[PDB]
């Protein structure tokens, strides 16, 4: 009993942006895949001729889920172009706001974007809250009681019997689904925590506004450093620290245990969604001009050969357009990039996406938490190694299990845990530096008439780079090459499937009308199409 034929998922929901996924299924398994991004805005075109100081305000609006990341990348890019070395405290404050962005982003992704692929919310109604509380209390040092979970169940019961299912309307789990495995109690725990995360993320986002003015779309970075003198005060630092501490407790006590419970129940998902090649840019620098000064270091890996990590050479990036809706077929290094839209409709002239197809030495590269984690592990990063090893031991699986949809989902958790701890280290260093009497947060600089610059951010979805060519002191070319562009852009002029396309081959689909298995893999990359296409 198994389907042969096409499946289209359009819109792919519970992502940022507008994605159309097309697959060919043979005998109930995916044999071919296309990743089609169906909105273009053209921010690179809009930036031409403008003041380089204004670029970060425009490019931040690439994406409000990975808010701040693009302001940071553009500011690193223009800092680099003008040759300014920002003060230590600007590096600390920028780094702290980025660490807070990762925690907010990954908690929301696991609960509010990914978990409905795995959690049947309406089966939570048939759970035994006393048994559910015992399970919840076994996996976390946080004590949960039967009454705690009954309150959740009572609230859901009222919502469901109103007949207005709202965001759960036509869910793939309604009425049951063979690819949904959780028992009612585990569904109830996950649902309780989904709801809890809706309020906790408010505090995680607030941590960014403490120094960064507001979330979404922070407003504290400038060429030369940051603007927020109030961030030096003990009051703001204390406010930040309290929000971080509560956010880290939630990561440690709620997200990771839940992640492990679900991964244990879906261990078959170590068999699907693997990829070959990985790229990461490193993040949280001590020196803005040295990627290898970052807490996570850059690297490149081909064909899962983690014993031979290659150095990242920024000149080996080219963005393809032969299968994208742009003019021609010539790949371009982003300092010679081109953004010349030319639409041909779906598969018109073998083109099917508004994303470009970045290739590294001609190869498709996964970026994101699984790249950052595996490359860091392989570089001997002790925090990443201790957390990854403990996750592998809890799940009873080998390192090979990481090369999969389940592995990528686990890596997003590992990175959240590791970054949550490291934020406390950065915070203390920040505090120490202030205590030495360094109160400087912005450095002077001058606009060159001609220059090139590049800014590198390892964002929650992976390696982000902004590239500028300054001409007559204005923006002559500005190119964004974004993590989802790497991961979810289309085929290149050598017809190599992108990471998401390739990962989809071999996906089983139990029910073609409700293809939750395709969503599990696509969501495990945490797609951002506004990011990818800009």
């Amino acid at each position: 009993s198994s389907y042969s034929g096409p499946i289209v998922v359009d819109p792919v929901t519970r992502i940022e942006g507008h994605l159309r996924i097309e697959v060919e299924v043979e005998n109930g398994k995916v044999k071919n895949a296309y990743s089609s991004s169906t909105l273009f805005r053209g921010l690179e075109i809009i930036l031409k001729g403008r003041d380089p100081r204004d670029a970060q305000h425009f490019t931040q609006r690439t994406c409000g889920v990975c808010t701040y990341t693009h302001a940071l990348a553009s500011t690193r890019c223009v800092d680099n172009a003008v040759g300014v070395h920002i003060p230590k405290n600007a590096t600390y404050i920028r780094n702290l706001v980025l660490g807070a962005q990762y925690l907010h982003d990954h908690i929301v992704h696991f609960y509010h974007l990914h978990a409905l692929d795995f959690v049947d919310v309406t089966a939570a109604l048939k759970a035994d809250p006393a048994k559910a509380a015992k399970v919840a209390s076994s996996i976390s040092p946080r004590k949960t009681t039967a009454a705690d979970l009954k309150a959740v169940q009572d609230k859901l019961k009222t919502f469901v019997e109103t007949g207005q299912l709202g965001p759960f309307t036509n869910a793939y789990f309604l009425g049951g689904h063979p690819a949904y495995y959780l028992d009612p109690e585990t569904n109830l725990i996950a649902t309780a925590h989904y709801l809890e995360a809706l309020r906790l993320q408010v505090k995680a986002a607030r941590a960014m506004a403490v120094f960064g003015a507001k979330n979404p779309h922070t407003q504290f970075t400038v060429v030369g450093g940051v603007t927020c003198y109030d961030a030096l005060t003990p009051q703001r630092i204390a406010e930040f620290e309290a929000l971080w501490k509560e956010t880290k407790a939630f990561v440690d006590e709620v997200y990771i245990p839940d992640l492990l419970v679900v991964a244990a129940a879906y261990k078959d998902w170590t068999q699907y969604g693997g990829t070959d090649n990985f790229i990461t840019f490193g993040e949280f620098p001590k020196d803005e001009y040295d990627l290898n000064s970052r807490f996570f270091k850059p690297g490149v890996v081909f064909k899962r050969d983690f014993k031979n990590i290659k150095p990242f050479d920024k000149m080996q990036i080219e963005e393809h357009v032969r299968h994208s809706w742009y003019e021609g077929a010539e790949a371009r290094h982003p300092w010679k990039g081109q953004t010349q839209p030319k639409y041909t409709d779906l598969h018109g002239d073998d083109r099917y996406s508004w994303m470009k197809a970045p290739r590294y030495m001609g190869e498709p590269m996964e970026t994101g938490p699984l790249a950052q984690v595996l490359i860091a592990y392989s570089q001997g990063h002790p925090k990443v190694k201790a957390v990854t090893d403990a996750v592998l031991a809890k799940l009873g699986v080998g390192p090979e299990a990481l090369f999969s949809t389940l592995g990528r989902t686990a890596a997003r958790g590992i990175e959240t845990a590791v970054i949550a701890e490291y934020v406390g280290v950065m915070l203390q260093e920040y505090k120490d530096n202030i205590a030495k009497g360094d109160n400087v947060i912005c450095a002077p600089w001058e606009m060159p008439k001609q220059a090139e610059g590049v800014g590198f951010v390892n964002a929650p979805r992976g390696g982000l780079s902004h590239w500028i060519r300054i001409e007559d002191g204005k923006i002559g070319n500005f190119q964004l090459v974004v993590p989802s562009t790497w991961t979810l852009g289309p085929r290149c002029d050598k017809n190599k499937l992108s990471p998401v396309e390739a990962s989809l081959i071999g996906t089983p689909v139990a029910d073609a009308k409700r293809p939750v298995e395709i969503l599990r893999t696509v969501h495990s990359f945490d797609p951002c199409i506004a990011c990818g296409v800009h």
Binding site: P11, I15, I46, L116, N170, A171
Partner: protein, 267 residues
């Protein structure tokens, strides 16, 4: 998705960065869980809904054709160039989707400067011919309430919805169709640095002791004097706003601000 008891909301995403969606998740007293379980019935929302694909298209149809009626909340500008080709959902152009659904809504709220006025992708040279909802759909008699900002304060969305539900009408609107209860004052007249402004006490640079001391940011580009919003009053995330973080206002609740307010660091 819907039926009686809670008012049905259909939330659409056009040409957008999802920052407006994220701003609603920051809702505070009420929080987003109260809003979704108690106040409203959120019947379509691509960012967080369980259904995808055909199932999601079916949920949208069910919500829009409801005899009970719905409220539309729209994020993002509508790309209109090349017959709307630059933005499609379910292989339908955004222009066509919005032209069919918005005239059926009992009320429409354009949420964020992109949906109100065109936004970042409408900035020069506007390659996708992006337009605000009321501009794009004037011909169909669509008159959305405009809640501007990039993204707006979510206090202003919730306050507008609550007003509408209570009073069965839009609140007083300004000449840009924004509620005067939130947009009736300049950022500047509410700013704590206004005494330095009045005194000609301006920071000459971000590194200056004047900036450290909290002097006015007008010489560094601040658009507070020509921007209407309630940022200094309500603040964001219950804790801060751009000038209190030492950075000038960039004018983000104003039409065409990407082109009108630039260069952002000049006045």
């Amino acid at each position: 998705l819907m039926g009686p008891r809670r008012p049905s909301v259909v939330y659409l995403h056009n040409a957008e960065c999802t920052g407006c969606s994220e701003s609603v998740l920051r809702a505070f007293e009420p929080y987003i869980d109260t809003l979704i379980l108690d106040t409203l019935s959120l019947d379509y929302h691509e960012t967080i809904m369980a259904a995808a694909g055909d199932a999601a298209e079916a949920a949208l149809e069910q919500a829009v054709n409801s005899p009970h009626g719905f409220i539309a909340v729209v994020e993002g500008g509508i790309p209109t160039a090349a017959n709307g080709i630059y933005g499609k959902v379910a292989n339908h152009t955004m222009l066509d989707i919005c032209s069919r659904i918005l005239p059926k809504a009992q009320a429409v709220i354009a949420y964020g400067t992109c949906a109100t006025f065109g936004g970042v992708q409408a900035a020069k040279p506007n390659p996708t011919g992006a337009k605000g909802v009321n501009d794009a759909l004037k011909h169909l008699g669509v008159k959305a309430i405009n809640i501007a900002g990039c993204p707006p304060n979510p206090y202003n969305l919730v306050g507008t919805i609550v007003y509408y539900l209570k009073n069965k009408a839009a609140p007083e609107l300004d000449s840009l169709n924004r509620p005067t209860m939130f947009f009736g004052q300049t950022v500047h007249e509410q700013c704590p640095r206004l005494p330095h402004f009045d005194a000609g006490e301006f920071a000459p640079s971000f590194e200056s002791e004047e900036a450290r001391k909290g002097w006015c940011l007008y010489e560094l580009g601040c658009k507070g004097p020509v921007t209407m919003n309630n940022c200094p009053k309500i603040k964001f995330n219950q804790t801060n706003w751009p000038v209190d973080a030492g950075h000038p206002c960039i004018g983000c609740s104003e039409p065409d601000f990407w082109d009108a307010m630039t260069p952002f660091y000049q006045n």
